[PDB]
């Protein structure tokens, strides 16, 4: 790979994972080596070996992977080696990477290595797009933020204990046990404001305990506030659907609508929500770019509209206007799509479901079943002033989604295309 795309590549997000875990090693373990006496001469070479591994990961990042990242300037995709290398040096990322590797065996001399957090935010942005249902990672990331705050608290408590002296008072850490999970336990009681700890006696202990508890109050509020936002965002669509469905039920109860009609409305709301996850697809389409909306309408309906004999030879742009004016309507089972003798003013495209055309003696005989991708009622679009009447009863054979274009919207988009207006009107009079 001479040039990799940061937004799409999976090897790049794997390397971002490696850079995050190299940066997590510096953030998590530098306060440990500063506070706890785990950095002994007997095991210093392991610490230095892992530090060299993390610095080598940093160096490979800034040298190889960051210099070959393709970028967007003026909308173009830049691929050549000359521009990608020069563009990264001018960005803030190279400036932060230079200061994340400066030399400054004290573990606090490696505190510049903790300043490579732009790779973590860039890695976070990929996980909000790579995996669906991204609030699960947000809970994990917030929990990891809490675990790190207790981690710093654990290091701060052991430093405060050691600085006063181990086992000097009841508040400080006595000295027995793992000495990390003991001080991390104090952080858990403190930062969550749980309590149960020995009371602080000296002035330094009371000040430290006061701020820690105060910090915990806001830290514990951040965890609740983040979960409150996660729960609200994860259930926002269901809440909107429930409020919209309950508004119609409240409306139908006020006007004493019978349950035969009301259950049909409840069935439509339940079916539309469990099929398309929406109540109106056009509310999403108006927020899209006009080229995005049109391309989606082409990718769904153009393979069907361009196959009917009525609009053959018409302008391609006029057909594109037909797709944008098509609206998705879901018909309940046994619902009459067309009544025999009503006003025909709509064209129906079967996106999904089966539609039966009735006939024979006294109706109720399936002359033909129209499957998905078939168009019926196209002749009705050519009539003027109620000139078309449906010649047969047409019913929906169970939960059919019809793309409907009516005569009014076709006539509104037929005044912009005088050439196809003449051709389409000529085809109307050629058959009657």
């Amino acid at each position: 790979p001479q040039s990799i795309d940061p937004l799409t590549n999976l090897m790049y997000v794997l390397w971002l994972f490696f850079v995050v875990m190299a940066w997590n090693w510096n953030c998590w373990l530098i306060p440990v080596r500063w506070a706890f006496p785990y950095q002994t001469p007997d095991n210093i070479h392991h610490w230095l070996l892992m530090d060299y591994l993390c610095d080598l990961i940093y160096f490979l990042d800034i040298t190889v992977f960051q210099t070959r990242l393709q970028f967007v300037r003026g909308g173009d995709i830049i691929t050549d080696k000359k521009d990608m290398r020069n563009n990264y040096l001018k960005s803030r990322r190279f400036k932060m990477d230079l200061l994340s590797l400066l030399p400054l065996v004290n573990p606090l001399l490696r505190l510049p290595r903790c300043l490579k957090y732009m790779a973590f935010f860039e890695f976070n942005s990929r996980l909000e797009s790579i995996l669906s249902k991204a609030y699960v990672y947000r809970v994990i990331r917030t929990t990891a933020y809490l675990l790190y705050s207790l981690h710093l608290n654990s290091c701060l408590y052991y430093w405060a204990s050691a600085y006063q002296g181990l086992g000097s008072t009841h508040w400080v850490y006595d000295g027995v046990g793992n000495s990390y999970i003991r001080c991390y336990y104090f952080a858990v009681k403190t930062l969550i404001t749980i309590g149960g700890l020995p009371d602080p006696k000296t002035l330094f202990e009371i000040v430290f305990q006061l701020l820690n508890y105060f910090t915990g109050v806001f830290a514990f509020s951040v965890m609740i506030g983040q979960m409150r936002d996660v729960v609200g965002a994860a259930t926002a669509g269901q809440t909107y659907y429930r409020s919209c469905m309950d508004s119609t039920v409240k409306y139908m109860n006020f006007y004493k609508i019978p349950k035969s009609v009301q259950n049909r409305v409840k069935t439509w709301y339940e079916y539309t929500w469990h099929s398309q996850g929406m109540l109106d697809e056009s509310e999403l389409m108006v927020q899209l770019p006009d080229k995005m909306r049109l391309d989606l309408a082409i990718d769904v309906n153009y393979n069907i509209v361009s196959k009917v004999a009525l609009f053959q030879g018409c302008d391609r742009q006029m057909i594109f206007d037909m797709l944008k004016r098509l609206r998705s309507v879901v018909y309940l089972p046994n619902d009459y799509v067309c009544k025999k003798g009503e006003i025909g003013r709509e064209m129906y495209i079967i996106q999904a479901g089966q539609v039966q055309v009735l006939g024979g003696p006294d109706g109720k005989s399936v002359l033909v079943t129209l499957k998905a991708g078939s168009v019926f009622g196209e002749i009705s679009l050519l009539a003027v002033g109620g000139g078309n009447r449906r010649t047969a009863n047409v019913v929906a054979h169970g939960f059919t989604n019809l793309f409907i274009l009516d005569k009014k919207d076709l006539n509104e988009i037929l005044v912009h295309y005088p050439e196809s207006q003449k051709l389409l009107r000529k085809k109307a009079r050629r058959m009657l």
Partner: protein
Amino acid sequence: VVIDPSGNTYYNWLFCITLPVMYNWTMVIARACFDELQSDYLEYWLILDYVSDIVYLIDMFVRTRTGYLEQGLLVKEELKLINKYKSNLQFKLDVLSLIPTDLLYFKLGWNYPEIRLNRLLRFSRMFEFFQRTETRTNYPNIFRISNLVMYIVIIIHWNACVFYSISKAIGFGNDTWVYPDINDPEFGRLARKYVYSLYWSTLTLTTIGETPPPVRDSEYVFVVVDFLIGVLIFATIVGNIGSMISNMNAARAEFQARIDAIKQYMHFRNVSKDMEKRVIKWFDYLWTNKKTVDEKEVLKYLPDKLRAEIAINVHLDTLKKVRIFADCEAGLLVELVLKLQPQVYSPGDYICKKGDIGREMYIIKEGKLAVVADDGVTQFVVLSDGSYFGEISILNIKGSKAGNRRTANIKSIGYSDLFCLSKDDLMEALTEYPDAKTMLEEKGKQILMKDGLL
């Protein structure tokens, strides 16, 4: 026979399968961790486990006989339903949840009921039943609270069992943190064992503490991890309840925001005090009478057929009583009803004055309207539900002496809910019915000649 997943039989079977799933999710770990509970009531646990396994088999049979919507049709072919079940991961979970592990009772003894922990893989049935009860219930917030509380109770029970198992592994009464010696007359009782374990788990999973501190490093690790799980649990509880409170207050919040914005506009524009009090009284009327919703915004999502049916059931009986629409075609009546716009008037409000331009026809759904003179003190006639006026102004008959103008003052005695039909909407409905438009114009001409206003 095929069970419809949206029917009541499927919901009843979801309830019938939830009880074995809840029993397996609670009492299996309860018996695994508390050996006295498993040993004392072994015959009851055997009967209940055999019953739950039978219900699991019947659940798999129901899954093979539960239809799904393909192209809008509920599939009733046996082979298609069986293949749809088998291709899903739920079939693998149901098979793994019914792998016979009770044969391991002869190898491990009666003291090990954690071999039946594979029966927990039927959690999808429980979750589906609760997510379908959420939609079916008329009290979604109450059931949401109940579901959250019972999930927290299940997690607390599981953590109580875990704490008792950890105390057993370390040793009862070994130090001050574990459960005390089970040779005590008080602490050796099974009820005391489970109840104290539940007390410890409730205090630890709610970030309350008030429990004896850990002594061993393993105990410190478990206490740290389990208060972290408690932090997640507490955050989930408070976040879910806060989202519930925000959702219940959402309509109140937006209505009060609209009232505040209108009051701020009034303070901007120096609106007179009596008009401000009239609008405040109007909004208090809207909130007190549950009329704050907008019919257009309520019914905008509905398709034309269902909204047409609702509108028909509301308005067709009073639209057919209109003298001009008596002979109108049914489809034109559907269009005209679908084009009716609600308008609500305060008491004393003038719907139309004499000499005003007649643009729409009004139909009274609720309320009383009075035809008054120029002064307004006297009343000619009181219009009630089903009455209407302005039916000739929308027609715009040529040669009319009125000339598309109102000939009388209509005043609302009280709070009247009217449904207006504009002339533009009438012509938009009539553009597909030219013969009906001609008949309407003829009827308007006949009306204006009988009254002598042509």
